[PDB]
């Protein structure tokens, strides 16, 4: 299938004393495999998946060094943004950065991305051609001018199209027993009275990987969104995910409704009906 490698960085400034709090996480598809927390004791990139533990000390020395460089960049960014926006040294502010690459079924480059946010809103993003920048406001336009002159986008495109993709293949091969397996949802249907006239049908999807999935309700073979509730896909905590979709129906009419489940791990969509 398709795969992606993505990195998420968050820096939260602390007024009053000291350095900002910085956290970094790295993902292949929906699996976290590395992390860094400036508040933890090791002060190293630490593993979070078994297939990355096998990498040697040269890797962990490089990753740690680069992630501390990232943290120092965000430290400076927070200082400069406070200046651009004329804000006081009293408030607490956030910078977030995310970048990565997707490969297709053939494992060749499909797409790369790199975006930045300040206080939770778009600041500057790399366009889909990896050649220019999207700037949300005038502060960010000044950054756009710094970066076009320093040719950051060019430097960034080499990584996304090249290095990012190479290591993604490497990770996919070593974690192949996990990263290259699909886990089909385990599905069932439960029933809960909500009065003397109504009943809830809840259609469950458990223990599936990856997290993309679609659950839809039908009545007499036609789509139904009225009186349906669909919760956000949630992590089970063991690496897999969960989801459910519910419909309120009139007691005695449960049989008219069917739940339909689509997932990469299923050769065909599943169909579920209530059974007494």
């Amino acid at each position: 299938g398709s795969h992606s490698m993505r990195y998420f960085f968050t820096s939260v400034s602390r007024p009053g004393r000291g350095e900002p709090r910085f956290i970094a996480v790295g993902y292949v598809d929906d699996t976290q495999f590395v992390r860094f927390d400036s508040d933890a004791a090791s002060q190293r990139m630490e593993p979070r998946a078994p297939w990355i533990e096998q990498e040697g000390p040269e890797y962990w020395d490089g990753e740690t060094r680069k992630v501390k460089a990232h943290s120092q960049t965000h430290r400076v960014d927070l200082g400069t943004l406070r200046g651009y926006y004329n804000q006081s040294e009293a408030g607490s502010h956030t910078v977030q950065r995310m970048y990565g690459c997707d490969v297709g079924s053939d494992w060749r480059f499909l797409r790369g991305y790199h975006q930045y946010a300040y206080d939770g809103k778009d600041y500057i993003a790399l366009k889909e051609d990896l050649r220019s920048w999207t700037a949300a406001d005038m502060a960010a336009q000044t950054t756009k001018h710094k970066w076009e002159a320093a040719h950051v986008a060019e430097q960034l495109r080499a990584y996304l199209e090249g290095t990012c993709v190479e290591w993604l293949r490497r990770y996919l091969e070593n974690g192949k027993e996990t990263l290259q397996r699909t886990d089909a949802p385990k599905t069932h249907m439960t029933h809960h009275a909500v009065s003397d006239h109504e009943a809830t049908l809840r259609c469950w999807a458990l223990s599936f990987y990856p997290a993309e999935i679609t659950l839809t309700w039908q009545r007499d073979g036609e789509d139904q969104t009225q009186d349906t509730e669909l919760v956000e896909t949630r992590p089970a905590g063991d690496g897999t995910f969960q989801k459910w979709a519910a419909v309120v129906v009139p007691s005695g009419q449960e049989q008219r409704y069917t739940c339909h489940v689509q997932h990469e791990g299923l050769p065909k969509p599943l169909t579920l009906r209530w059974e007494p």
Binding site: T73, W147, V152, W167
Partner: peptide, 10 residues
């Protein structure tokens, strides 16, 4: 493998 090199300022 995170980006290697001089990550410029904003």
């Amino acid at each position: 493998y995170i980006w290697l090199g001089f990550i410029a300022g904003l």
